[PDB]
Write a protein that binds this ligand. Structure first.
Ligand SMILES: [Cl-]
Lengths: 557, 563
């Protein structure tokens, strides 16, 4: 146990003496800042395998070079060490983070534009300046760090000797006198922390008594680790209620809400934030300051109406057929739940046709809010929720105020008016985008979303395989130029009911009536259906031009 | 602020001064911590919350526990005196400080009414002549003892760890020195130990903490979790040693969930499946240790996987055919022997319907119920060894069926006997509504019942009629009151009722519900005589006359059914 060095540990990892029994870049950079800032590491748990049990278990190596496509699974042990070896039971991620940073690489898929066709390594600015962080660490590509901020690869601390690196900086003339001075202090801090410092601590033990020492660690070190601000806040908040049955009631509603229809995944966090919003509390932040005794008193005095409304909220989203896979913005339920609370609406709201227009007004808003790439439900959300809540109080007594909510949102910069580019992106959306279902719900508003339904390909994806298209006679150049489009909105439609024929056959053995067939089709924006698969592209580009103009109109206010 | 420095005396002294508080609400466990403390094992970093007096009256803080009383103080007391200056609310380390506090600063019949003889005050003690117990792996002996059980074992000198905080070092080192009860050489050993304690509670920096304000709790919290435990440490997840060697995580979770949904419900753990793995795959060692989870052992397990998966499910269903649920089967470690029997004989759901297995299922149930009625450790200690021997018995007798004869005798040799002692019999007749053992006793004493169809335990005389005030209308001595209301929950007022909660009976008194729902004189007479009800008083005043008469009727059946 006692103490130890990061260099010592990283090297036993390399010699494969430190292993792993079975089992975010920016976050690795954050460990390294905290480390160089002197935030100490906690104690780690280690298991020493007797040489007799060397073959008894299947150990795996830590990750050094990460590639989401190439190496993403912890590689198995290559050469079983010839002597005593250790397997880590706690601190795996902490160790892996140091390994990737000082001896490895990280390749993550770049977020590209919607038109789509990189091994980076850890670097530190020696002329690091603080940011209200203290030390700027970034995973960068070599050419992006050669930028004419003096960037240094932290990895060389493990490959070169201090004297060489200290000297390179001093012999660099791109740097002025005062600069080289700062750079040296910083480079030294790094070398003198990865090397020459007692940061690692480790409870170690053998097979027989491993049972006892894991439990000592759990008593002495933490048990039931804080789920961040979240379980803390819940803990803090529940501790200001008369009912010592409060903790449960929240978890209970969360469960009921997540079994409303086909299924949802809200968090206790949403319930707490909703509580604040519905209680007309002036701040809606998820902060312990806002979960005081006075604030939580209001919630406890109004819990039953608030719970009911949030449940009806999910019931309404499922009336519009949302589930855990298509609704990604749980933050959008909050305005809706304030509305059902302001008007004290009940389950009857979903049935009475008298409220049908208002339900379709809400859906218009929700869909358009979720169709925006991003910017509506992310940053600045707390100011928005506040101003949206306000709108509902001043003019919701009549009905949902879309006119006002639309412009309040424009003012906070979060307009729901789509640009020609945002519209062009929406017309090439892929099958998997959660935004796809909802675009179709808007474009095709007549459906019983309240009942089972799904999204399918007019021309089935099965036929879209390189051989099959070529058997029919598609230029080899156009192969794989169609298979990609087979999964794009112009070949996507909304169908009634749960989940082998070309569309024009299914549509003539299921739509015998010429007049009714022509209608279902024009209603699904299917203007024509060509019989040779080698004419699908003329179809695709035709439906798109039709849908593009239908998307513009449907998002015009 | 990261105070790496800090002593236990300082913490506890700030705890007593009500400056260290809590925002939100077992002895042996506390005792294990104290041994490890003196074994040098350090504490983890704690997280503390600074409260400026501008927000002092806004969050309802609570004190740590010191003198615990299941009946009186079982919840952290509210703040008696709020401090005027800045103060702290612990977020991490809540339990660890609450073990030091109670440690250095403070029954079985569960006759809840009795204040006396029913809540003995025990305080932490240490044997200064402690010695290595290579079984527990302990090197220091800490037990919670009462003053009498603390005062002449030749090698046990008990020191109340509490005086360390009230007396002076010199004084205690002197008391041990001027104690003629001790022997010269053994006086030296005591001193060395007493010193380590005084010098660990004081004079040694063991407490470490992060004191943070509201402004930046979010950030430093996150920083703490990065550098410290974020994966909530771990568990004895030997399941990993197998998803690895075997070529699974899903299958286990599946058996667990399916087994937990068989009847009205069960709450089994992944642990049982794995333990049954070794039990049913004939591995000579059933320990949940990592040693038996070897590549070659886990080879037999995946071959017997389909065979065991079924038996564990068949086991759970047999239990639900006996009315068992999460609420009434706390000792889930008793399923393991049952599963071996089903696997040995390769039975199926047809064991649950075919009348040819009735005598057999009833032999099993009797044993199971009897095993659970004992409040001692038939399924608490020496399990790996009992289970190992039961396996042998079941394997050598899987013909006529359950070797109950042999199983009882092997349990008797291992001291896990099921012959009931007269005193233990008497407490079974006084079992409360809550003790899960009660459900079973009723099913053992009333073996003719539809355990199959939905059923609930109810009270002959309804619980709602027993309110201090309600009994004054009928006129009862207020002398025996908080005890009469307790008897409303004991066995003589408890019965097995078919169906579910009948709100229509809670209102009526027994002679007003049986009298109508059972109109035939001959039928009622029997439904009742079968539920051990000889007479049913109609004046609530005579309840205690009914209780004693039934207790005598039930005591009779208990002695007949056991023994
Ligand atoms: Cl914000």
């Amino acid at each position: 146990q006692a103490g130890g060095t990061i260099r010592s540990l990283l090297d036993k990892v390399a010699e494969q003496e430190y292993l792993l029994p079975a089992i975010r870049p920016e976050q690795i950079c954050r460990l390294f800042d905290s480390l160089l800032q002197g935030y100490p590491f906690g104690t780690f748990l280690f298991w020493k395998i007797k040489p007799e049990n060397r073959d008894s278990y299947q150990f795996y190596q830590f990750m050094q070079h990460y590639h989401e496509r190439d190496n993403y699974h912890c590689e198995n042990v290559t050469q079983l060490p010839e002597r005593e070896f250790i397997a880590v039971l706690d601190g795996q991620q902490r160790i892996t983070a140091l390994n990737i940073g000082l001896r490895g690489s990280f390749a993550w898929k770049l977020t590209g534009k919607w038109w789509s066709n990189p091994v980076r390594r850890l670097h530190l600015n020696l002329l690091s300046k603080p940011d209200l962080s203290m030390y700027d660490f970034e995973f960068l590509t070599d050419d992006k760090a050669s930028l004419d901020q003096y960037w240094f690869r932290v990895g060389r601390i493990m490959e070169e000797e201090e004297d060489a690196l200290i000297d390179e900086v001093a012999d660099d003339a791109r740097l002025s006198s005062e600069q080289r001075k700062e750079a040296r202090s910083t480079l030294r801090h790094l070398y003198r922390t990865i090397h020459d410092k007692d940061k690692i601590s480790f409870y170690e033990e053998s097979d027989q008594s491993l049972e006892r020492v894991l439990n000592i660690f759990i008593r002495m070190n933490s048990g039931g680790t804080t789920l961040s601000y979240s379980d803390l806040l819940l803990s803090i908040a529940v501790a200001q209620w008369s009912s010592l049955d409060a903790r449960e009631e929240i978890h209970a509603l969360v469960d009921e809400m997540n079994r409303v229809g086909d299924g949802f995944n809200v968090s206790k966090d949403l319930v707490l934030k909703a509580g604040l919003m519905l209680s007309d509390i002036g701040s809606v932040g998820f902060k312990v300051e806002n979960f005081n005794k006075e604030n939580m008193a209001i919630l406890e005095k109004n819990w039953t109406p608030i719970r009911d409304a949030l449940l009806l909220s999910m019931q309404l989203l499922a009336s519009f057929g949302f589930n855990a896979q298509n609704l990604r913005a749980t933050s959008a339920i909050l305005p809706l739940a304030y509305y059902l609370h302001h008007r004290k609406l009940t389950a009857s709201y979903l049935s009475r046709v008298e409220y049908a227009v208002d339900r379709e007004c809400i859906r218009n808003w929700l869909i358009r809010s979720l169709l925006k790439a991003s910017g509506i439900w992310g940053s600045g959300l707390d100011t928005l929720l506040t101003m949206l809540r306000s709108d509902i109080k001043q003019s919701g007594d009549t009905g949902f105020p879309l006119a006002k909510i639309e412009a309040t949102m424009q003012q906070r910069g979060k307009s729901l008016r789509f640009d020609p580019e945002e519209i062009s992106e929406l017309a090439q959306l892929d099958y998997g985008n959660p935004r796809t279902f909802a675009l179709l719900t808007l474009l095709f508003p007549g459906f019983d979303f309240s009942r089972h339904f799904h999204v399918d390909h007019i021309y089935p994806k099965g036929l879209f395989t390189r051989n099959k298209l070529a058997k029919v006679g598609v230029p080899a150049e156009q192969l794989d130029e169609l298979i990609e489009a087979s999964n794009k909105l112009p070949n996507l439609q909304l169908l009634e009911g749960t989940i082998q024929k070309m569309p024009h056959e299914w549509y003539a053995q299921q739509w015998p009536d010429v007049n009714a067939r022509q209608a279902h089709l024009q209603s699904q924006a299917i203007t024509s259906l060509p019989e040779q698969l080698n004419q699908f592209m003329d179809f695709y580009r035709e439906r798109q031009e039709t849908l593009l103009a239908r998307i513009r109109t449907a998002l015009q206010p």
